[PDB]
Amino acid sequence: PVLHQEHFKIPENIKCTVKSGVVTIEHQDPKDKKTTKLVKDLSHLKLDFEYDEKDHQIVARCWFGNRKLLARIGTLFGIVKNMITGVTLGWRYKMH
RNA sequence: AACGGUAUGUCGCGCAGCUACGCCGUCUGGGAUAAUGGCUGAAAGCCUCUUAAGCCAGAAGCCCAUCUAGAAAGUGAUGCA
C-alpha cells in the first residue's frame, strides 16, 4: 500500500540497453579492441526498469508493493553492480 | 523246450520325454522431487541456501529408459476383393 522508486548510476565508458526486462550490459576497451557482453532475463521480479540517457543511470520502481517486493529493488542493483565489474575488469576466484 | 499268460510280479539296466539335486541371463542411463547441503543476494548500507526472486547439487523412493500384455484406444501402411 505504498508508492516509491530508487536509482543507480551506471558510469561512463559502459553501454547498456534495457527492453522487456532484459538487461544487456556491454563494454569496449580502447587499446586492445575486444567487445564483451552480458545478458540476463529479469522478466520475474516485476519492476519497471528504465534507462536514463541523460544521467546514464538506471531507475527501478515498485508500485503498491509488500516488503517482499521492495527487496527486489535492492536485488536488481546487486546483480547489475556485479555485472558492471564482471564485464569491465572480470571476476577471479582463487581457491587452493 | 521255444514263445507266452496270471500273481494289475519281482529284480537289473534303461533311450525318449518331463524334471530338479543340473545349467545360462538379471544389463543400464536419465528427469523432476523428499530430507539436506551449496552459489549469487536483498529485506536489515553489515549478515544470511530464499525465512524473498533467480541458479546448482541431490535418495534402494516417484516418473521415464528396459521388459509382459495390447485397437471395442473399435487406428494405420501394404496386397488382393
Is strand B within 7 Å of residue A44 (CB)? yes
Which strands sit side by side in the sheet containing A50-52, from one edge to the other?
A3-9, A57-63, A50-52
Asked if A8 and A77 touch (Cβ cutoff 8 Å), the reply is yes
**B79 C1' – A78 CA distance, angstroms?**
72
Chain B nucleotides close to protein (CB under 7 A) are 40-44, 52-54
Kindly provide the resolution of this structure in angstroms, with one decimal: 3.2
Closest by CA position to A87, among listed A18, A21, A44, A40 = A40
Q: Which residue has the cell 564485464?
A: A87
Is strand B within 7 Å of residue A67 (CB)? yes
- The structure was resolved experimentally with cryo-EM
Please give the nucleotide, over all strands, whose C1' is closest to the CA of residue A45: B53
